[PDB]
């Protein structure tokens, strides 16, 4: 009668550790893809897909060349300082 | 495949009918486990109750009855020293168990949290060329050709 | 029982030995301080 | 009235109890504060409305 | 109030607990600060269209 009961009692404490493997690795399957490139990749594919979309603006609105960078910033400073050239003796 | 999108939506919600499957699982394991300590609170009580008279047999002298006493004792207590074990053991399951569990929570939500942060790129990137693809037809002889060609006329 | 009582355990997690040492001492001195101050003000 | 005439255990059980009594005081009390910023502001939205 | 009136270990053991707080406080607050140049220039993006 002890070994039957005995033998019964591991039976449900035993019978939980399956029932926890079986969520383990199937919580962490699904949960794997979105990390390493698996799902990550739908992560990182669409980022490609926006590095595909992104690029094309890039050449169809060609950016401003580093040139261009130094000629407009290189006015501003006199515009600012010419225009509060103009206002530091106007209204010194 | 589906829009993905939708998956993330769907898989995410296959671990929502998981995580509960994990959450009911891991109270059947802490059921167990207390059930165990009463059956040796019990067995002991027992061993104390057949303390009890040997808290009482052998005095006045009869040692013979407490030697039969004690020896039926050993019995409970072999039950109780065999039963006792086997509950620490099962504290470090249910105790890393939860850990398991503790952290994964963080990790879904923490994952579920970049879901809607990311998804908007692609809203954005979406927006982002067609907006500037018809944009782009008016200038540079695409549709500024339009502008151009009946110029042109 | 044993069941249902876990079930809310698991979803209401138990004051830990560690909150419970802080609850604890907090209310000595809650109870002394209130009462320094009263051992003191009306003394 | 308790501590006086020197029954300090009376007192002791006494201020036991208020702890309570405190405990549901010092929660509730913090809890209105932070709502008046809510009508103060609200009222200047409708106000500004 | 802990580690007052020489209560060390008592505040040992709440500071490690603490740290798991900040750790999640330190990783929470640096993905905020990121955001905003996301939020900042496509604004930006949105204004000179």
Same mark, same amino acid.
């Not at chain 1, 169809?60 to 600012?80: G, I, M, R, Y």
């Not at chain 2, 165990?36 to 013979?64: M, P």
């Not at chain 2, 504290?91 to 908007?120: D, F, I, P, T």
């Not at chain 2, 018809?134 to 110029?151: C, K, M, Q, V």
């Given at each position: ?92 | 495949? /589906?829009?993905? /999108? ?14 509960? /499957? ?30 009890? *008279? ?9 040692? !013979? ?8 004792? !050993? ?27 503790? *952290? ?50």
């Amino acid at each position: 009668e002890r070994k039957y009961l005995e033998l019964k009692s591991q039976k449900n404490l035993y019978l939980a550790r399956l029932k926890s493997a079986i969520a383990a690795q199937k919580i962490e399957e699904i949960a794997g893809n979105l990390d390493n490139a698996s799902a990550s990749s739908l992560f990182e594919r669409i980022e490609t897909k926006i590095l595909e979309l992104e690029a094309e603006r890039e050449l169809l609105n060609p950016p401003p060349s580093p040139l261009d960078k130094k000629f407009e910033q290189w006015e501003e400073q006199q515009a600012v300082e010419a225009t509060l050239a103009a206002m530091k003796a106007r209204r010194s | 495949q /589906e829009a993905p /999108e939708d998956l993330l939506e769907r898989l995410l919600g296959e671990m929502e009918l998981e995580l509960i /499957e994990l959450r009911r699982a891991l109270a059947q394991t802490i059921a167990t486990f207390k059930s165990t300590e009463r059956q040796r609170d019990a067995q002991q009580l027992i061993a104390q109750r057949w303390y009890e *008279k040997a808290q009482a047999a052998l005095d006045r002298g009869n040692e !013979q009855l407490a030697r039969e006493a004690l020896g039926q004792r !050993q019995s409970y207590q072999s039950h109780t020293e065999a039963l006792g074990k086997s509950l620490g053991e099962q504290r470090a399951l249910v105790e890393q168990v939860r850990g398991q569990l503790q *952290k994964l929570e963080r990790k879904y939500l923490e994952l579920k949290s970049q879901k809607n942060l990311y998804l908007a790129r692609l809203k954005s990137a979406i927006a982002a060329q067609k907006i500037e693809e018809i944009a782009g037809n008016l200038d540079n002889a695409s549709a500024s050709s339009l502008f151009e060609r009946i110029e042109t006329k």
